[PDB]
């Protein structure tokens, strides 16, 4: 009782099951999700579900079955709300779900339908990325000042520098698969857009006819090479698993 913790039956009320066919052999948790879903289509997907396909206008479409109780089968073309009727014919509701009509403004950027502290960061605009790539390779006014000048965080703008340059390289090489040539457009429209106002080692010797493959490093006795002891915590469960420059997990 004080703990119990059983099946995760939908928190919201959902049409249950009764006097099942002896062969029906069915489950409630299945019918529930089944209603969160809509009569499967030939194509095999679900022509209708509050959020079946994908958004297309910078406004994200995060699950809000909280505000809308549970009914979540809007029309594909008329974007018109429906609900399941006694016999089993999809049809409109007699009461506006409320709130879902005037969804709290910012709330739209609240991915999880619980944590009120996780918010999707609006995508960056093409112009920002374009203008930003040029600013560096033109004068590169202090990224620190330019980031302040452009809101974006200091390591934010600098990250774009590498991305845009790589994007440009890809554009020149046209590597960008016809897929990305479109897919990206859908991502650009699943989230919003920001920027709206608001003397080192020993080797000085002749490196020709000799070479310092056996390169070195100067140091001072006392604080230098390996130590006698350092119980190799290799039989313990916190070993130092460094990664080879080549690309291989390698022990410290």
């Amino acid at each position: 009782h004080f703990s119990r913790r059983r099946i995760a039956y939908p928190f919201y009320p959902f049409k249950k099951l009764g006097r099942q066919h002896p062969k029906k052999h069915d489950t409630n948790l299945k019918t529930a999700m089944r209603q969160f879903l809509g009569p499967k289509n030939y194509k095999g997907e679900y022509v209708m579900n509050k959020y079946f396909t994908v958004p297309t206008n910078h406004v994200p479409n995060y699950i809000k079955p909280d505000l809308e109780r549970g009914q979540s089968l809007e029309h594909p073309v008329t974007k018109k709300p429906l609900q399941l009727r006694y016999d089993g014919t999809l049809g409109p509701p007699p009461v506006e779900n409320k709130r879902l009509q005037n969804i709290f403004k910012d709330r739209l950027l609240q991915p999880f339908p619980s944590n009120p502290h996780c918010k999707t960061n609006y995508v960056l605009s093409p112009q920002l990325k374009q203008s930003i790539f040029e600013e560096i390779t033109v004068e590169g006014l202090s990224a620190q000042q330019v980031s302040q000048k452009y809101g974006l965080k200091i390591p934010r703008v600098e990250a774009i520098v590498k991305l845009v340059s790589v994007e440009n390289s890809w554009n020149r090489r046209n590597r960008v698969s016809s897929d990305l040539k479109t897919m990206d457009e859908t991502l650009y429209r699943m989230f919003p857009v920001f920027d709206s106002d608001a003397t080192k080692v020993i080797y000085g010797e002749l490196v020709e006819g000799e070479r310092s493959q056996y390169k070195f490093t100067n140091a001072k006795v006392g604080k230098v090479g390996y130590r006698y002891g350092s119980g190799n915590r290799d039989n313990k469960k916190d070993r130092r698993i460094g990664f080879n420059k080549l690309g291989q997990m390698v022990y410290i």
Binding site: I202, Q213, K215, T217, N218, K220, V224
Partner: protein
């Protein structure tokens, strides 16, 4: 070819494949890995691999050596016997005359 009362050897602390040698100065009686008189540095057997493109170019993988050039002096002078490798290292690093050559097949 480099043995005497005071010597400079390579302590073994590296694992398999890459047993990083440790340029250490120890007495002849003292064992190689036995706490040496002083640790000049560590000489990796495998040259630290450089960028594969750099490897294709003039750049060559270079072993990382912690050898303390100024420190060996106190020993070279007093009179230690650096391992042939260390001997060569000193010769190549300019620590001592290249003529410290032992005229081996090298």
């Amino acid at each position: 070819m480099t043995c005497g009362l005071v010597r400079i050897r390579l302590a073994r602390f590296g694992r398999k494949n890459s047993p990083v040698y440790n340029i250490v100065v120890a007495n002849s009686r003292k064992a190689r890995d036995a706490k040496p008189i002083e640790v000049l540095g560590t000489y990796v057997p495998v040259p630290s691999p450089v960028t594969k493109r750099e490897l294709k170019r003039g750049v060559v993988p270079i072993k990382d050596v912690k050898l303390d050039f100024d420190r060996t002096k106190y020993w070279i002078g007093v009179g230690a016997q650096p391992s042939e490798t260390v001997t060569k290292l000193l010769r190549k690093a300019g620590i001592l005359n290249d003529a410290w050559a032992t005229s081996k097949n090298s």
